[PDB]
Amino acid sequence: NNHSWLIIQADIYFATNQYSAALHYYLQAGAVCSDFFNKAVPPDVYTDQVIKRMIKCCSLLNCHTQVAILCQFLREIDYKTAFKSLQEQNSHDAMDSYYDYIWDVTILEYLTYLHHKRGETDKRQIAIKAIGQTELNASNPEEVLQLAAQRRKKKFLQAMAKLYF
Amino acid sequence: MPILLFLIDTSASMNQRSHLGTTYLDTAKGAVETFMKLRARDPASRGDRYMLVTFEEPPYAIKAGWKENHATFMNELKNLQAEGLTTLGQSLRTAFDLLNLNRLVTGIDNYGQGRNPFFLEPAIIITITDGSKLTTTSGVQDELHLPLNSPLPGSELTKEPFRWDQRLFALVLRLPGTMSVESEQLTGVPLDDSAITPMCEVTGGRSYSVCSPRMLNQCLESLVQKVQSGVVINFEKAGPDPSQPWHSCHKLIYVRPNVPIGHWPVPESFWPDQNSPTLPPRTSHPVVKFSCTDCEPMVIDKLPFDKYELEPSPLTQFILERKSPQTCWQVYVSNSAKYSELGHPFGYLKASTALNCVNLFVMPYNYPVLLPLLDDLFKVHKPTLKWRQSFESYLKTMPPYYLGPLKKAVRMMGAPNLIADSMEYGLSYSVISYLKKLSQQAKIESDRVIGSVGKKVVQETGIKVRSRGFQVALLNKDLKPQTFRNAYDIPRRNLLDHLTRMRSNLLKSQVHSVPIAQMGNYQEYLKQVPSPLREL
């Protein structure tokens, strides 16, 4: 349960292109620092480097919706990598089931446009319903939005913990 | 008659619920109908053109343009779907192109022949949007950049997509998910902070940031108050004070018709010469510079002059604060004279005698040397050659495009066969030929775009099954199941009932799906029905 050593092991697995093992140990470090993602992970443990490497690991496992969700964990949301990964059509990560974990209106707007362009009307309706939530309104008074982001972070990271260990 | 072009945001971020329970697109549509109701309260809007542009692809972006009636505009405003990206720059470019494609074929712009404020087609663009980031299917933009990739022919003559008589107003929807208690919402509406705000301010408009339905109604009332007929003039401070906010303003002057009448143009920013092949690009708002030093308004009898009332602004507040209607502030555009870069005063800013409004009086190009001279001849004189050598000295400094208006003015004044009636050289033959070719191409895309707004864009989609050219069909909206003519359209669940219905139809032994607006046709159904007899 030493989070720094878990980060070191995850980095070693990431260096040898063992992306599933790297995600396993990155999520283990995040579960150490919080209480299984009940608290927010401290930013000196999930730094931008660690979240970016988790993004790369999820990209190379073709879990592209997980890439889109992990892109908004950063200090500034990486819309380029999220939009690039969401365009992929070989996904292994239950694409529309993960739309609850997306709190950013821009990513959901891109998802709705992408599903309308490809004729995926059902996923387009799911994305429109996800945008049409009062808690996800971008004009919410900056504390409703923060709590929505935090609860989606907790739920998503617990889902990844269940998936990878 | 004014043009009301609505640039509705149809990006998918417009599917955001408010505390009202409706999406931002529903609020946008309702804002448009309430705006049209408040506009129809004004009885001067009997002739008024409504246009609709969305954020979709340029085949589908213009939903109602020229030669589209009220019914098509309403039927397409109701049927908007927010399923796109926030392509604000491309949509703004298409909206300005839809406003400006007729300008070169009908010659409102009057290129190279002076800027005529009475040559206007007054339009405003009301864009209704949210504060979401702009997206162009590669990332966010965080700054508004109108693309210049497929220019309309003649777009380089103005160097800015918007024109003299066009103002962009943003109605930025920021209705929160939960209702916010506020008693200060009855105050003035704040300017929005999105990327649309500087583009609204550079065209002489402003952005409205709503946060409640009552703030929305207040903004709609303010927007109804801003539907005017005029042109936007950039005023600048030339000399020192007689930086404070009255130094620069993209204010609006008013052009009241009686069709508008006028005689003198606002002078160009260059000196016309026949050596130059290409006409210089002029700013869409003519940068005029007022002289803060006090002068005297100079008006003689029977004089064709045009008076334009400025809209209320910090400049007019500054002028009316220094209460002195007997004086005036001379105004001129820079680089208009042949030699001097400062230019000669083409007019003055004089406050009204009632201290109510500030009027821009446009005059001939150098009125302090022509009005005493022309007034001297029409007071004393049969011109004398001592006067005519002075008149030639004035005509040596006058720009060539003023020669026509000066000729007409002295013709209606009482001196028809004056020197101003002798010849008119004007521009360079390359420039006239270029303008005529630009008019022809402007007609070409004028009849191209107008033919393509409706019944020329049909979208069909496919699944496009990947290999690891086949596609899977979708449930089309215009499926039109010809079940009585095609047996494949009959579902198995009602095959027997439909079978016996077809058997009853063919032998001697859908309907009532009228689209709602026509199912209660009071006048139409009785018109086809025969008339009864009349009463005793």
Q: How far apart are CA B345 and CA B291, in angstroms?
A: 9
**Tokens coding B184:** 């200060």
A chain contacts of residue B211, beta-carbon cutoff 8 Å? 139
Chain B residues lying within 8 Å of A136, measured CB to CB = 16, 177
Rounded Cα distance between A21 and A9, Å, is 9
Question: By the 8 A CB rule, do B51 and B3 touch?
Answer: yes
DSSP string, B46-110: SS-EEEEE-SS-TTTSEEE-TT--HHHHHHHHHT----B---HHHHHHHHHHHHHTTHHHHT-S-
The DSSP 8-state label assigned to residue B276 in this structure reads: -
Q: CA A115 from chain center: how many Å?
A: 19
Beta bridge partners of B146: none
Task: Using CB atoms within 10 Å of the CB of residue B335, give its burial: 0 to 12 exposed, 13 to 18 middle, 19+ buried.
Answer: middle
Nearest CA in chain A to B13: A109
B119 and B71 in contact (C-beta within 8 Å)?
no
B297 in A contact zone (CB under 8 Å): no
Which amino acid belongs to residue A157? Answer: L
Distance CA(B94)–CA(B87), nearest Å, equals 11
Is the minimum CB–CB distance between B13 and chain A shorter than 8 Å?
Answer: yes
- The CATH class of the B4-232+434-448 domain is alpha beta
Question: Rounded distance, CA B424 to CA B395, Å?
Answer: 12
Alpha-helical segments (H) within B232-380: 314-321, 367-380
Q: Does B180 touch chain A (CB under 8 A)?
A: yes
Out of A109, A116, A121, whose CB is closest to B135?
A109
CA nearest neighbour of B86 among B125, B31, B132, B127: B132
d(CA B226, CA B212): 21
A139 CB near a chain B CB, below 8 Å? yes
CA distance B234 to B288: 6
Angle at B301 (CA atoms; ends B299, B307), nearest 5 degrees: 50
Q: Quick check: B25 contacting A, CB < 8 Å?
A: no
Chain B nearest C-alpha distance from A44 (Å): 27
CA B105 to mean position of chain CA atoms: 17
Of B187, B217, B213, nearest to B24 (Cα)? B213
> Could you give the CA distance from residue B118 to residue B266 in angstroms, rounded to a whole number?
10
Resolution (A): 3.6
Contacts of A69 (CB under 8 A, 6+ apart): A98, A101, A102, A156
Min CA distance, B472 vs chain A (Å)? 10
Helices and strands counted in chain B (H then E): 13, 13
- Write the CB contacts of A41 (distance below 8 Å, at least 6 apart in sequence): A30, A33, A34, A157
Q: Do A133 and B17 lie within an 8 Å CB cutoff?
A: yes
Residue B167 β-bridge partners: B124
The bridge status of strand B358-362 relative to strand B347-351 is antiparallel
B182 contacts chain A (CB < 8 A)? no
**Neighbour count for residue B238 (Cβ, 10 Å):** 19
Q: Of B86, B132, B178, which has the smallest distance from its Cβ to A144's Cβ?
A: B178
Is there a contact between A61 and A27 (Cβ–Cβ < 8 Å)?
A: no
Q: How far is B455 from chain A (nearest CA, A)?
A: 21
Residue B350, C-beta contacts closer than 8 angstroms, at least 6 positions apart: B297, B325, B327, B328, B329, B358, B359, B361
Given A110, A127, A140, which is nearest B177 (Cβ)? A140
Q: Which of B140, B180, B461 sits opposite A79 (nearest CB)?
A: B140
Cβ–Cβ contact B138 with A under 8 A: yes
Alpha-carbon dihedral angle through residues B256, B258, B259, B262, given to the nearest 10 degrees: -70
Q: What is the DSSP string of A83-117?
A: HHHHT-S---S-GGGGGGG---HHHHHHHHHHHHH
Half-sphere exposure of B273 (CA within 13 A, CB side): 9
Q: Please, which residues 307-336 of chain B have a Cβ atom closer than 8 Å to chain A?
A: none
Interface of A with B in 28-67 (CB under 8 A): none
Nearest chain A Cα distance for residue B318, angstroms: 38
State whether A131 and B15 contact (CB < 8 Å): yes
Give B44-47's long-range contacts (Cβ < 8 A, gap of 24+): B45/B2, B45/B227, B47/B1
Lay out the sheet containing B166-173: strands in order across. Answer: B62-64, B49-53, B3-8, B123-130, B166-173, B207-210
CA distance A155 to chain B (A): 22
Residues 6+ apart with CB under 8 A from B352: B325, B358, B359
User: How close, in Å, is residue A76 to chain B by CA atoms?
Assistant: 12
Instruction: With beta carbons less than 8 A apart as the criterion, state whether B5 and B125 touch.
Output: yes
Residue of B nearest to A134 (CA): B177
Q: Does A135 touch chain B (CB under 8 A)?
A: yes
8 Å CB contact between B265 and B405: yes
CA distance B189 to B170: 12
Contact at CB, B177 and A80, closer than 8 angstroms: no
Please give, rounded to a whole number of angstroms, the shortest distance from the CA of A3 to a CA of chain B. 34
Any chain B CB within 8 A of the CB of A146?
Answer: no
A 10 A CB-CB count for B185 gives 14
Nearest-by-Cβ selection for B140 from A106, A108, A134: A106
Compute CA B315 distance to the chain's CA centroid, rounded to the nearest angstrom: 23
Searching chain A, which residue's CA lies closest to the CA of residue B141? A79
DSSP B189: P
Alpha-carbon distances, residue B80 vs B29, B76, B388 (angstroms): 9, 7, 67
**Contact residues, chain A, for B474 at CB < 8 Å:** 119, 121
User: Long-range contacts of range B254-257, CB-CB < 8 Å, 24 or more positions apart?
Assistant: B254/B228, B254/B229, B254/B230, B254/B308, B254/B309, B254/B310, B254/B311, B255/B117, B255/B118, B255/B120, B255/B122, B255/B229, B255/B230, B255/B231, B255/B308, B256/B229, B256/B309, B257/B229
SS3 B314: helix
- Which of B86, B178, B464 is facing A140, going by the closest CB pair? B178
User: What's the rounded Cα separation, in Å, for the pair A64 and A92?
Assistant: 8
Three-state SS at B10: coil
CB contact under 8 A, A109 and B175: no
Q: Are B115 and B234 in contact (CB under 8 A)?
A: no
Q: Report d(CA A53, CA A150) in Å as an integer.
A: 21
| Binary contact (B177, A132; C-beta < 8 A) | no
Q: Which two tokens stand for residue B226?
A: 């801003």
Pairwise CA distance, residues B387 & B381, whole Å: 10
Q: Does B183 touch chain A (CB under 8 A)?
A: no
**Can you list the alpha helix ranges (DSSP code H) found in B144-270?**
196-202, 213-225
Using an 8 Å Cβ cutoff, are B84 and B59 in contact? no
Are A112 and B15 within 8 A, CB to CB?
yes
Residue B412 tokens, joined: 């209606």
User: Shortest CA distance to A41 belongs to which of A155, A162, A153, A165?
Assistant: A153
Chosen for mutation from B16, B140, B212 (greatest number of chain A CBs closer than 10 Å) is B16
